[PDB]
DNA sequence: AAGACGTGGAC
DNA sequence: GTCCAAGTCT
């Protein structure tokens with residue numbers, strides 16, 4: 505049916521030739537491949553590079569990561585987004601240490617039982633690190649295959665991914681699955697790009713139904729995103745006389761879990777300074793807002809308003825709250841939105 | 855199934 | 866503005 509060998513040859517030769525020397529490609533420690541694959545979920549290669557370098561310098565092996573304090577691991581992820589990824593990884597390595605004594609399982613089902621490890625990450629890690637011939641279908645590979653085999657199913661359905669997964673097993677080169685899997689990923693990065701794909705340069709120009717029919721720009725097929733809710737948020741930056749600032753740790757469930765923030769209130773309607781004033785009551789005086797700005801998430805947009813305030817100590821500071829010397833805020837992991845809050849507060853203070 | 859879950863860069 | 870970023874949990 506499908507000229508697998510001729511296809512594989514023009515792909516893998518292209519790949520030994522064009523492969524980028526990325527940091528996590530220096531070797532095949534499963535730990536390092538695994539860390540990189542988690543960081544790369546919904547995140548551009550170029551963004552990941554500096555975080556990977558710093559993360560592995562802090563946590564050079566699996567037990568280092570497991571032994572480390574949740575707070576330390578989260579701070580190393582600060583700014584990357586989708587922070588549940590690193591809680592899942594941390595939990596997952598703790599389990600690989602206790603349960604399996606430090607060795608990354610090479611059994612798919614056992615590896616996949618670990619938190620964070622879905623079908624993509626099973627494929628990527630096991631095919632690169634241990635040679636296991638599982639497909640590693642990322643969003644890019646779904647685009648590639650959609651264009652190659654002219655598969656028009658919505659790639660948002662879980663079922664479509666399962667179809668693409670089966671296709672990969674058929675066309676795969678079981679002689680070297682790691683390189684096969686990498687090469688498809690690399691092809692989507694370097695040639696078969698979301699817009700204006702470089703089909704003329706493409707190595708597998710000859711096997712591409714979409715190019716033949718002239719529709720590469722028309723793929724892949726994906727349901728248009730839903731518009732996201734908007735959420736007004738009042739944020740208090742409260743300083744006492746010695747310059748200390750009040751922060752609090754978000755709970756471990758839901759949005760931006762276990763990250764630190766300046767005390768904040770979702771103000772569906774009005775009464776920002778009021779709804780804020782009452783929440784810290786549950787001794788503070790808040791002045792007029794100093795800035796308003798938006799911050800996007802995938803599924804909502806915060807509309808933040810920052811209110812300065814003076815803190816007067818009439819009691820102890822009870823969890824989740826913490827009294828932080830300004831010079832110590834850098835120790836805590838904050839979301840990018842509250843990083844900006846602080847920046848805006850300090851430039852107003854000038 | 856399809857919503858929750860961050861952030862940034864290239865059109 | 867849109868689409869994607871080497872997805873996964875619920």
Ligand code: SF4
Pocket residue numbers: 648651652695696697701702703704706707708709712714715720
């Ligand atoms: S010929 Fe174009 S559309 Fe087909 S795989 Fe190559 S870059 Fe993608």
Ligand SMILES: [Ca+2]
Pocket residue numbers: 615616617618620621622623
């Ligand atoms: Ca799994």
Ligand SMILES: [Ca+2]
Pocket residue numbers: 755756757758759
């Ligand atoms: Ca919660």
Ligand SMILES: [Ca+2]
Pocket residue numbers: 642643644645689692693871
């Ligand atoms: Ca990709």
